[PDB]
């Protein structure tokens, strides 16, 4: 028996392991859209005024 | 000899919905995203003079 | 002004312990701990709290 | 006591070759609802658990291997083996009923009489398994006339890893493995691969880059060639590892053994025998899978290579030059 359920408890760290690496992959991919549209301060300020 | 401690780290998940970089953009949930081939949103402008 | 502990936290090699420490010559910290968590809930991941 | 017969009644039952998919027309479309493994995509939620996914895990492909049972003598076959060593099965003649001759790569060392800095580790380590060579020849009264016209590599069969050796005074039992990944006897839920030593082994891809496709597929190929040696017949065998396809291999063997074929054809410029001139076969040992990390080992020392899921797939003996 606690080679079994020690046996659920690696599979599911390994599949609690594979939802909570896909959740940074939000915060990557929407961090990298606006790395795209962001142009410096030094070009985008003479085009404020 | 002795075992004096047997230590592990958990990682705990941040969920993009509550990280406030979230603020910077609107989070629709969308059931089927793989039927989608390309989506629109059109703008109208009128100027006055 | 600070708030500490008084005392030293013992630990002394009671009878669960001292089988393994004559017999098997290895001891460890909490036998209890270690045999509540084998036996008693098997199947319980590793929390923080 | 019938409880520790129940025991076969799950066991067995629960493991029998998966039924033909036959249905009944009148039944209607239950059929549909039979086929569960075609199925590959399985859904997952918010926070999956093992209750979601017990039947994802619940459906696997069928694979098994087909064993070989070989009964050996027991002075051919040493009685301590690292039990995943590739085999070769020698036959000459049905003298008995069932008596077979088995050939590990460091017994078939001992019978060349190939030189000690060629292979400079298993010399150390197959002289003392063995006596000094002689104890095998015995057996084999024709190996300076098997080697002269060439037909050594015309009666070696290659058959895979070792399993299990059940090991007695006079006789040694022998289970190999053919078709896939044999299952391990002593540790349970294990899978034997197959050893072999660092020594014999020849990498073949190998760059600094100073770029070579990825794939699912990598082939362990076995060598076996023909020289001389202090004008003495004498063979070689080598190991290759390469998944370039065949085509390229042939070429990238013949670079390996230049010197080889360089030191042998300067004497046939005086005599010219027709039996002389066959030189080397190349066999297909099976597939490995890509980005395995072939592990290292030391046993008494001798370095011995290891390959996780090995499958074995032997095929002919192909006569290059």
């Given at each position: 028996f606690t080679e079994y359920a020690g046996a659920i408890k690696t599979i599911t760290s390994a599949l609690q392991f594979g939802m909570d690496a896909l959740e940074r992959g939000l915060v990557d991919t929407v961090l990298a859209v606006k790395l795209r549209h962001a142009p410096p301060v030094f070009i985008l300020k003479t085009l404020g005024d | 000899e002795a075992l004096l401690g047997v230590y592990t780290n958990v990682v705990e998940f941040v969920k993009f919905l509550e990280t406030a970089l979230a603020a910077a953009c609107v989070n629709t949930e969308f059931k089927d995203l793989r039927r989608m081939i390309d989506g629109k949103i059109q703008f109208k402008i009128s100027m006055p003079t | 002004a600070m708030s500490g502990p008084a005392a030293y936290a013992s630990y002394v090699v009671r009878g669960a312990n001292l089988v393994t420490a004559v017999s098997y010559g290895r001891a460890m910290r909490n036998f209890e701990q270690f045999m509540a968590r084998i036996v008693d809930h098997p199947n319980a991941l590793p929390s923080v709290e | 006591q019938a409880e520790?017969?129940?025991?076969?009644?799950?066991?067995?039952?629960?493991?029998?070759?998966?039924?033909?998919?036959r249905v009944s027309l009148t039944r209607?479309?239950?059929?549909?609802?039979?086929?569960?493994?075609?199925?590959?995509?399985?859904?997952?939620?918010?926070?999956?658990?093992?209750?979601?996914?017990?039947?994802?895990?619940?459906?696997?492909?069928?694979?098994?291997?087909?064993?070989?049972?070989?009964?050996?003598?027991?002075?051919?076959?040493?009685?301590?083996?690292?039990?995943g060593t590739f085999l070769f099965s020698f036959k000459q003649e049905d003298n008995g009923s069932s008596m077979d001759?088995?050939?590990?790569?460091?017994?078939?060392?001992?019978?060349?009489?190939?030189?000690?800095?060629?292979?400079?580790?298993?010399?150390?380590?197959?002289?003392?398994?063995?006596?000094?060579?002689?104890?095998?020849?015995?057996?084999?009264?024709?190996?300076?006339?098997?080697?002269?016209?060439?037909?050594?590599?015309?009666?070696?069969?290659?058959?895979?890893?070792?399993?299990?050796?059940?090991?007695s005074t006079f006789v040694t039992k022998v289970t190999s493995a053919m078709k896939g990944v044999?299952?391990?006897?002593?540790?349970?839920?294990?899978?034997?691969?197959?050893?072999?030593?660092?020594?014999?082994?020849?990498?073949?891809?190998?760059?600094?880059?100073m770029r070579e496709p990825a794939g699912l597929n990598v082939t362990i190929y076995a060598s076996l060639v023909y020289l001389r040696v202090n004008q003495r017949p004498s063979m070689a065998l080598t190991f290759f590892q390469s998944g370039?396809?065949?085509?390229?291999?042939?070429a990238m063997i013949k670079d390996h053994f230049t010197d080889v074929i360089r030191t042998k054809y300067i004497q046939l410029r005086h005599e010219l025998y027709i039996n002389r001139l066959v030189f080397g076969a190349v066999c297909t040992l099976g597939t490995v899978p890509f980005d395995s990390h072939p592990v290292h080992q030391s046993l008494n020392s001798l370095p011995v290579?290891?390959?996780?899921?090995?499958?074995?797939?032997?095929?002919?003996?192909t006569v290059f030059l």
């Open positions: - | - | - | 520790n017969a129940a025991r076969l009644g799950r066991q067995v039952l629960g493991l029998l070759p998966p039924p033909t998919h209607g479309p239950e059929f549909a609802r039979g086929v569960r493994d075609l199925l590959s995509k399985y859904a997952a939620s918010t926070r999956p658990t093992v209750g979601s996914l017990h039947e994802a895990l619940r459906q696997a492909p069928f694979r098994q291997p087909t064993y070989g049972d070989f009964l050996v003598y027991s002075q051919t076959f040493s009685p301590q083996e690292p039990l001759m088995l050939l590990t790569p460091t017994s078939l060392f001992m019978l060349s009489g190939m030189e000690a800095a060629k292979a400079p580790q298993t010399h150390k380590v197959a002289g003392v398994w063995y006596g000094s060579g002689s104890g095998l020849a015995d057996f084999i009264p024709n190996l300076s006339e098997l080697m002269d016209t060439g037909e050594f590599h015309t009666l070696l069969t290659p058959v895979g890893p070792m399993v299990q050796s059940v090991h044999g299952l391990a006897r002593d540790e349970p839920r294990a899978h034997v691969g197959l050893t072999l030593p660092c020594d014999m082994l020849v990498d073949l891809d190998e760059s600094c880059p370039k396809g065949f085509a390229e291999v042939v290579l290891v390959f996780a899921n090995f499958e074995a797939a032997c095929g002919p003996w």
